């Protein structure tokens, strides 16, 4: 997470749909915005959200009538990707819940996030349905795939970010944040060896294929493999960036991938996962290691949302005579 | 686990290498045999082994001197499959440690177990190497792939079982147990709903292609899918048999697969995993749920080992004038 002193979103209200761990909430609050409603489906996610924010998000958004949603300026949603069978063509999906709320509450901004391939899903019309639905609801639609490693977070993680402004506001200067040099690497986020001993996997079929590198580099650096060398069976350098965290991946080093740390090969700790997703150390992670992996592997990258939120605020606040 | 009153292995000593949870120990002890040495690599496997048997198995078998292994009549090993590059070809593998122990200790019987495809691995070479090695050590070699579902256990789980008798014994009559009708199904092995609600997975992309069946059947019965319907994304009926447990599988319903139970979709509980692996309810599972899944996913099926152990005894005991 980064520090933002210029609170571009001060005095604005947002809601956090499909809140998960509350990544959007961390991001928008860091810019001064106020959360007036959150919704999260998963009970274990509601749990950890409650641990960190004091309140439990409302559950199943389908039971919740849009008229009951508090007035708000920004709607956030890192929503599940689903295939559709514009606005009426989005029915049946969780995206429709976003569309029905947008139609009722007409926030100034709709800020959404999804997987990197979202633009390709269903031969391109999952994106086209979302875009057309947003247009029909009288919003512009700006989408760009951004990679975490380009925004200060040492993880290979491309995601699509979609920002929509209500047309009456006439916003013409929204820009995605510009990428910058990576100065933090996996090594910079590690816990002491003692705290992660349980994550060490000693295997006789380990084959180290490359020597540890001498200079940090903003890419994934594979050093070795175990077994057949497939998913969850590869070992990376902490002087590089993290491979993409996965909520549901399998393999010996499932979810995190394996890392060469002080002569040992191990998974990342849930706290290290938090860090490579941009979560602050003040954020309490779920007690279950396996549930924490799933939650972070499914989460948003805080830092990227912060840069975007700041730019959303920048655009909303530029109102010359 | 089945009851055996005719203790064919009474008076015989066995060792339990790559002991894991001690499945071989349960099977052979049920037939009257006494364990005189066990070895298990994994720290967490040692823990639960100790919880159940009162003793901690020795670690790293590669550093154990073969001459120090106690005298025994039966060597058991459910060992990790590894590609080779006869006896000499085994070097660099965990099987080499079995061979060097066999060479020094000369047990009457070597009883091994591995994955179902062990036969076809490295195009037959892996099994050739094992067989030729046992032959060079003056053992006959018998191997067959048996499916848990044919031996009273409702799980789709084929494994190769290898049984070798020392040549001087002139054992001519060893037979693998004959398969029989399955009369136990997943539903019979389930815990009450109160014990398992933490394993329930409520989702929206659940697509059910068949209704719950009314007949029991010795087959895996897929009723639905989630996501893309791949690994750990399939829902099965409990009126069928369990899909193969996996130590490192991924997906939403990782390791156990998903089941339709009283209107809910859930993973199996580690106790249910124990049961579909033939472990008795008196066997304590690992306190860590995720660790217990890995353990049972990589374990042996007790009942199949009991039937084989009994037949090993039957052959050793047939000694006419």
From Swiss-Prot, chains A, B:
<keyword id="KW-0238">DNA-binding</keyword>
<dbReference type="GO" id="GO:0003886">
    <property type="term" value="F:DNA (cytosine-5-)-methyltransferase activity"/>
</dbReference>
<dbReference type="InterPro" id="IPR001525">
    <property type="entry name" value="C5_MeTfrase"/>
</dbReference>
<comment type="similarity">
    <text>Belongs to the class I-like SAM-binding methyltransferase superfamily. C5-methyltransferase family.</text>
</comment>
<keyword id="KW-0808">Transferase</keyword>
<keyword id="KW-0489">Methyltransferase</keyword>
<dbReference type="GO" id="GO:0003677">
    <property type="term" value="F:DNA binding"/>
</dbReference>
<dbReference type="InterPro" id="IPR050750">
    <property type="entry name" value="C5-MTase"/>
</dbReference>
<keyword id="KW-0949">S-adenosyl-L-methionine</keyword>
<keyword id="KW-0680">Restriction system</keyword>
<feature type="domain" description="SAM-dependent MTase C5-type">
    <location>
        <begin position="12"/>
        <end position="319"/>
    </location>
</feature>
<dbReference type="GO" id="GO:0032259">
    <property type="term" value="P:methylation"/>
</dbReference>
<feature type="active site">
    <location>
        <position position="81"/>
    </location>
</feature>
<dbReference type="InterPro" id="IPR029063">
    <property type="entry name" value="SAM-dependent_MTases_sf"/>
</dbReference>
<dbReference type="InterPro" id="IPR018117">
    <property type="entry name" value="C5_DNA_meth_AS"/>
</dbReference>
<dbReference type="InterPro" id="IPR031303">
    <property type="entry name" value="C5_meth_CS"/>
</dbReference>
<dbReference type="Pfam" id="PF00145">
    <property type="entry name" value="DNA_methylase"/>
</dbReference>
<dbReference type="GO" id="GO:0009307">
    <property type="term" value="P:DNA restriction-modification system"/>
</dbReference>
<protein>
    <recommendedName>
        <fullName>Type II methyltransferase M.HhaI</fullName>
        <ecNumber>2.1.1.37</ecNumber>
    </recommendedName>
</protein>
<comment type="subunit">
    <text>Monomer.</text>
</comment>
């Amino acid at each position: 997470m980064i520090e933002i002193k210029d609170k571009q979103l001060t005095g604005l209200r947002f809601i956090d749909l499909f809140a998960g761990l509350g990544g959007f909430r961390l991001a928008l609050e860091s810019c001064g915005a106020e959360c007036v409603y959150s919704n999260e489906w998963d009970k274990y996610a509601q749990e950890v959200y409650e641990m960190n924010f004091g309140e439990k998000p409302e559950g199943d958004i389908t039971q919740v009538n849009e008229k009951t949603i508090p007035d708000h300026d920004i709607l956030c949603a890192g929503f599940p990707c689903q295939a559709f069978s514009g606005f009426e063509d989005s029915r049946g999906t969780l995206f429709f819940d976003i569309a029905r709320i947008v139609r009722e509450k007409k926030p100034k901004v709709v800020f959404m996030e999804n997987v990197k391939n979202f633009a390709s899903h269903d031969n391109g019309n999952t994106l086209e349905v979302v875009k057309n639905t947003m247009n029909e609801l009288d919003y512009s639609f700006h989408a760009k795939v951004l990679n975490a490693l380009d925004y200060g977070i040492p993880q290979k993680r491309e995601r699509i970010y979609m920002i929509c402004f209500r047309n009456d506001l006439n916003i013409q200067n929204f820009q995605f944040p510009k990428p910058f040099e990576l100065n933090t690497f996996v090594k910079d986020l590690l816990l002491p060896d003692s705290e992660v001993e349980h994550l060490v996997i000693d295997r006789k079929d380990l084959v180290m294929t490359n020597q540890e590198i001498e200079q940090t580099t903003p890419k994934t650096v594979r050093l070795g493999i175990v077994g057949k060398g497939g998913q969850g069976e590869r070992i990376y350098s902490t002087r590089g960036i993290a491979i993409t965290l996965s909520a549901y991946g399998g393999g010996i080093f499932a979810k995190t991938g394996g890392y060469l740390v002080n002569g040992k090969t191990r998974k990342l700790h849930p706290r290290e996962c938090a860090r490579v997703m941009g979560y602050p150390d003040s954020y309490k992670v779920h007690p279950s290691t396996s549930q924490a992996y799933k939650q972070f592997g499914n989460s948003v990258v805080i830092n990227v949302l912060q840069y975007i939120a700041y730019n959303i605020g920048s655009s909303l606040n530029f109102k010359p005579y």
